[PDB]
Nucleic acid binder design. Structure first.
Lengths: 50, 95
DNA sequence: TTGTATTTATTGCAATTTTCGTGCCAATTTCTG
DNA sequence: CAGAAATTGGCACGAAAATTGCCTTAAATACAA
């Protein structure tokens, strides 16, 4: 009793934001709490931020 | 007559009554016959492609059909159209 | 030996009603002079 | 303007088609006299 089937695929790009869960290879997981601007991150003698 | 009552058949086209296949006939050019259930489809096709400003009347459908050798009277065409629930020619025109 | 109670086999006929296409013609629209 | 041509559908034909109510037993078979 089925005549036709139409399938539609939608693609969306997800960015990073507070609340997303990140981790590492040594069991150190965590949740992002802030997106700090560049001129507030700590920097070294050469001015490269972290 | 008894067997074909209220029993349905499933074809790739759709589901039918199994009594939908028994139909009437009208004469044809060459001594053959043409079924009413095919003349209804032809009439629907012709009406669904007419000029919207000038719709085809029953005579202009009878004459159009009587060039493939279908030999249908005008009143029969009117009966088929009213069976298809299609308004007359004067009620299908539009701007 | 035959007459009979028992058990299958039988999914059709023939009236009676309903529907078919198409003609007659009155009522309503459209058209050209 | 208006008479005429064109269109539409109710009603009427015979014929065909479709339904519906019934013959509410005849013949083969195994058993008994």
């Amino acid at each position: 009793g089925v005549l036709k089937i139409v399938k539609v695929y939608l693609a969306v790009k997800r960015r990073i934001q507070p609340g997303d869960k990140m981790a590492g290879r040594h069991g150190n997981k965590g949740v992002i709490s802030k997106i700090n601007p560049i001129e507030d991150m700590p920097y070294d003698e050469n001015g490269t931020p972290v | 007559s008894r067997v074909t009552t209220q029993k349905y058949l499933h074809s790739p086209r759709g589901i039918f009554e199994l009594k939908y296949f028994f139909s009437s006939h009208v004469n044809t050019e060459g001594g053959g016959e043409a079924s009413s259930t095919a003349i209804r489809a032809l009439v629907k096709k012709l009406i669904a492609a007419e000029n919207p400003a000038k719709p085809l009347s029953d005579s202009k459908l009878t004459s159009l059909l009587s060039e493939q050798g279908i030999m249908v009277a005008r009143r029969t065409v009117a009966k088929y159209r009213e069976s298809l629930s299609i308004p007359p020619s004067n009620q299908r025109k539009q701007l």
